[PDB]
Amino acid sequence: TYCQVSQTLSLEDDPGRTFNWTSKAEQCNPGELCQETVLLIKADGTRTVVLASKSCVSQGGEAVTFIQYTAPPGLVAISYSNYCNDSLCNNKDSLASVWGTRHCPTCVALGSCSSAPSMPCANGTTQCYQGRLEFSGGGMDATVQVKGCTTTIGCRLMAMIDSVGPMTVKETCSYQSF
Ligand SMILES: *[C@@H]1O[C@H](CO[C@@H]2O[C@@H](C)[C@@H](O)[C@@H](O)[C@@H]2O)[C@@H](O[C@@H]2O[C@H](CO)[C@@H](O)[C@H](O)[C@H]2NC(C)=O)[C@H](O)[C@H]1NC(C)=O
Ligand SMILES: *[C@@H]1O[C@H](CO[C@@H]2O[C@@H](C)[C@@H](O)[C@@H](O)[C@@H]2O)[C@@H](O)[C@H](O)[C@H]1NC(C)=O
């Protein structure tokens, strides 16, 4: 009936090393458990967008879920979600265990990219991608603009998955296949 609670959005140089996810505890309503959910999104050569949620929650079992939505080279999207049902269980402190050539405008930002310089695409990329990710729920409401060379096909940076712990995801994009 106590859980760590925090909602953070950040751009992160080296979130594997530096990110401190330890948060203050708060009392849940009865018949609520804890969750810790983080989503990390990166383009080639960019910083990493980090959506990190800790809260009391009423829906769900005690699964631990690790997903790679989209694989390098290029765009990378990865999540860790731990739902757990004893006081202060959502206590992960660190993201260490979690995280004729073509050219594409490349960037990541919360909101809108200030710029999207052109970068050469590695072997294995299928397309240029210009997308927008809409997040809602869990006190985590946000947009992420993502452009770059990617392995994903069409508007599938988030692999057609609608939700990430307490967050809902909508994806819209343009893409230019090779
Ligand atoms: C989350 O835990 C609650 C609390 O359960 C109690 O404490 C646990 C550590 C364990 O020892 C349980 O046996 C205890 O009951 C769960 O609530 C209970 O669930 C049972 C079975 O559905 C039900 O008949 C009891 O009356 C429930 N008690 C309350 C307070 O509602 C809850 O279901 C757990 N949820 C998950 C997803 O694990
Ligand atoms: C991470 O931070 C911990 C203490 O944090 C402080 O407590 C939390 C609840 C935050 O609200 C923060 O703003 C406070 O200053 C440290 O005890 C812990 O050791 C830190 N981890 C590392 C690896 O440095």
Side-chain angles (χ1 to χ4, degrees):
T1 55
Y2 292 86
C3 300
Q4 287 193 23
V5 181
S6 49
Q7 293 81 44
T8 71
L9 302 166
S10 56
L11 285 175
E12 232 49 264
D13 285 329
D14 196 4
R17 261 212 298 109
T18 62
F19 196 93
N20 190 343
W21 203 6
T22 302
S23 312
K24 324 272 256 159
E26 291 183 11
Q27 188 190 87
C28 309
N29 306 310
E32 283 181 350
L33 45 88
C34 308
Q35 66 85 21
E36 54 194 11
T37 302
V38 57
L39 179 56
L40 298 97
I41 306 162
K42 196 199 186 302
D44 187 16
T46 72
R47 304 192 152 97
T48 296
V49 182
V50 186
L51 305 94
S53 170
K54 290 198 186 182
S55 73
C56 302
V57 65
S58 51
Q59 284 162 337
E62 292 195 81
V64 185
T65 304
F66 172 93
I67 299 168
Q68 179 165 260
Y69 302 85
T70 297
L75 304 189
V76 182
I78 286 174
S79 70
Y80 165 88
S81 191
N82 172 21
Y83 283 57
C84 62
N85 197 7
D86 63 54
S87 264
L88 308 193
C89 58
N90 61 341
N91 68 342
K92 188 151 184 62
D93 113 69
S94 133
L95 304 188
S97 71
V98 177
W99 185 239
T101 136
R102 308 305 230 107
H103 307 71
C104 308
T106 304
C107 69
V108 296
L110 289 165
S112 274
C113 299
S114 53
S115 51
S118 182
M119 300 188 95
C121 304
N123 208 40
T125 50
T126 62
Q127 61 179 211
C128 298
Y129 172 99
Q130 305 90 37
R132 181 154 259 113
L133 299 183
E134 215 67 57
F135 299 93
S136 51
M140 287 309 287
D141 303 82
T143 25
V144 182
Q145 179 159 231
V146 184
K147 304 181 180 197
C149 314
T150 186
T151 54
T152 195
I153 297 163
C155 298
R156 296 203 256 247
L157 178 55
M158 287 304 290
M160 299 184 83
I161 294 164
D162 297 340
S163 69
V164 178
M167 296 182 261
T168 296
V169 210
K170 290 213 200 76
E171 173 171 354
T172 56
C173 95
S174 302
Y175 68 99
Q176 302 84 232
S177 318
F178 317 150

